[PDB]
Amino acid sequence: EIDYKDIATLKNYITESGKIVPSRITGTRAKYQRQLARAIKRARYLSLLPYTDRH
């Protein structure tokens, strides 16, 4: 939420599989879910999250 650049904050919102739970079974807001899945895209492009599970 509002940030994507700090991993010590971002890691509180994701599973240990790098995923999120679908919005309608967590009662979360529509654009908040899109902005969360986009914060994960931006954090992968910032090398804070992996492209491969290898090594």
Binding site: S47, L48, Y51
Partner: protein, 100 residues
């Protein structure tokens, strides 16, 4: 003028000599009357894979106001000195309060 973030990853155990290496080329933007709002560390962060042999970065933020016809002259000034990767320029809207 136009605004850019320009963030350097920076090795944490050379983070006292790497900002001086960036300042070895800042003449390329202060020659154009660019204004530099910190060129300073934000905080240590951990990576999902190693960059310059290390899984960590010190994150040094430039925060610059400059003309638009000099951002390609600045990124070409770092084309061969091996300190710039994947741009990290992040154009427009300018810095947040104390970069949070």
């Amino acid at each position: 003028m136009r605004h850019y973030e320009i963030v350097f990853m920076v090795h944490p155990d050379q983070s006292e000599q790497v900002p001086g290496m960036i300042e070895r080329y800042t003449a390329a933007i202060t020659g154009a009357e660019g204004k530099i709002h910190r060129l300073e560390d934000w905080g240590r962060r951990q990576l999902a894979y190693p960059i310059n042999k290390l899984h960590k970065a010190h994150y040094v933020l430039m925060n610059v106001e400059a003309p638009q016809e000099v951002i390609d002259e600045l990124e070409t000034t770092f084309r061969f000195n091996d300190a710039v990767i994947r741009s990290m320029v992040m154009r427009t809207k300018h810095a947040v309060t104390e970069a949070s």
